[PDB]
Design brief:
The complex is a heterodimer.
Chain A lengths: L2 E7 L2 E3 L2 E10 L9 E3 L6
Antiparallel strand pairs in A: 1-3, 2-3, 3-4
Chain B lengths: L1 E5 L3 H13 L11 E4 L3 E7 L3
Antiparallel strand pairs in B: 1-3
The chains are: A mainly beta, B alpha+beta.
């Protein structure tokens, strides 16, 4: 087939500061990492 | 290839609590506590034979 996996790009308020993370997710084991995380960035 | 703005519900706040938890462990930002998620939340669909 073709579909490898997914990727989420949220905006997370934690400790009252806006951070922006990217979670990878395997289309087969449905497991995931925490590819990245930054901030604080501003409200989108 | 494809992208989408997915709803900001429970499956999306799990993705947020998970993020923070994994980074509480890397703590470039310390020991943060998860608040909630705002929008837009996005989702990339990846694909690749060769």
């Amino acid at each position: 087939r073709e579909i490898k996996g997914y990727e989420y790009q949220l905006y997370v308020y934690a400790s009252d500061k806006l951070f922006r993370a990217d979670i990878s997710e395997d289309y087969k084991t449905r497991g995931r990492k925490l590819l990245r995380f930054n901030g604080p960035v501003p409200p989108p | 290839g494809e992208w989408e703005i997915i709803d900001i519900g429970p499956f999306t706040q799990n993705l947020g609590k998970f993020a923070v938890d994994e980074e509480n462990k890397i703590g470039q930002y310390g020991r943060l506590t998860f608040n909630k998620v705002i929008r837009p939340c996005m989702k990339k669909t990846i694909y690749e034979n060769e």
